Design a protein around this ligand. Structure first.
Ligand code: VO4
Length: 282
């Protein structure tokens, strides 16, 4: 009954009202507007909350779910790549989790540039990519890891760990087990990198807008939100945070579409159930 169909129908009812409420109007002041006609959002109706936006020219948002601080974004457009790399380096990114699949990146129709697996130059920024480990996550899903080295004349050179999930388990107990394994890997990768910065006395440790994990799929609202939900449930600081609370917080801080599909919410419900974590606010 706490996790039964009645409770799930009530949770879905609240979250649907919230999505409808957050739907962008034309020139909505809640949302980042493109200036001059340059494409900002990769999808028209998947917009970027202005007050938590990381950069004026990116579809990317600071997200805090309970105590867990991240950045969720869309897969950068080709025109956004230099700005994207500057965000990653400025943030001192302890891990970048890419949940777009290999076959989606390869599909040129999608306009997803292969920016973390290839070396190249983007304006004055130079990027080197070195593949490191590969970690199985269950049911044949694989994470490819990379060290992404970002160089720019007169800027501190920054190296970003990358966790690339090459295919995705859309639904089921499989998705739930794999998500939990991915959350642990991403959080472990970030802790190792953050520890390095702390051991070198980096001032970035002081700034809570910095050292955040950066997560994106294609739109940054589906697979991305399912991962962020799992990571927040892995944080020992977030006891008694409800699934309602955590999805509502994601939606107010990025857009109403966070947790896009019923199958993604149901993974989050199952993880909460395994923890005895409440679904609803009382
Ligand atoms: O690349 V996602 O369509 O599951 O926001």
């Amino acid at each position: 009954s706490p996790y039964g169909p009645e409770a799930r129908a009530e949770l879905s009812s609240r979250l649907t009202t919230l999505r409808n409420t957050l739907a962008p109007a034309t020139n909505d002041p809640r949302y980042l507007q493109a200036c001059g006609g340059e494409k900002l959002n990769r999808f028209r109706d998947i917009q970027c909350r202005r007050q938590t936006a990381v950069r004026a020219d990116l579809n990317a948002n600071y997200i805090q779910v309970g105590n867990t601080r991240t950045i969720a974004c869309q897969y950068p457009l080709q025109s956004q790549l230099e700005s994207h790399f500057r965000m990653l380096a400025e943030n001192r990114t302890p891990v970048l989790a890419v949940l777009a699949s290999s076959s989606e990146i390869a599909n040129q129709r999608f306009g997803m540039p292969d920016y973390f697996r290839q070396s190249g130059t983007y304006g004055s920024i130079t990027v080197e990519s070195k593949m490191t480990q590969q970690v199985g996550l269950g049911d044949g899903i694989m994470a490819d890891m990379y060290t992404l080295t970002i160089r720019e004349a007169g800027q501190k050179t920054i190296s970003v760990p990358v966790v690339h999930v090459t295919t995705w388990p859309d639904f089921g107990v499989v998705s739930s087990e794999v998500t939990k394994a991915l959350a642990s890997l991403v959080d472990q990768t970030a802790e190792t990198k953050r520890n390095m910065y702390e051991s070198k006395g980096s001032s970035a440790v002081a700034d809570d807008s910095k050292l955040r994990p950066v997560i994106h799929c294609r739109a940054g609202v589906g697979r991305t939100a399912q991962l962020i939900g799992a990571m927040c449930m892995n944080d020992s600081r977030n006891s008694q945070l409800s699934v309602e609370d955590m999805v509502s917080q994601m939606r107010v801080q990025r857009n109403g579409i966070m947790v896009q599909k019923d199958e993604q919410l149901d993974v989050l419900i199952k993880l909460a159930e395994g923890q005895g974590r409440p679904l609803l606010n009382s």
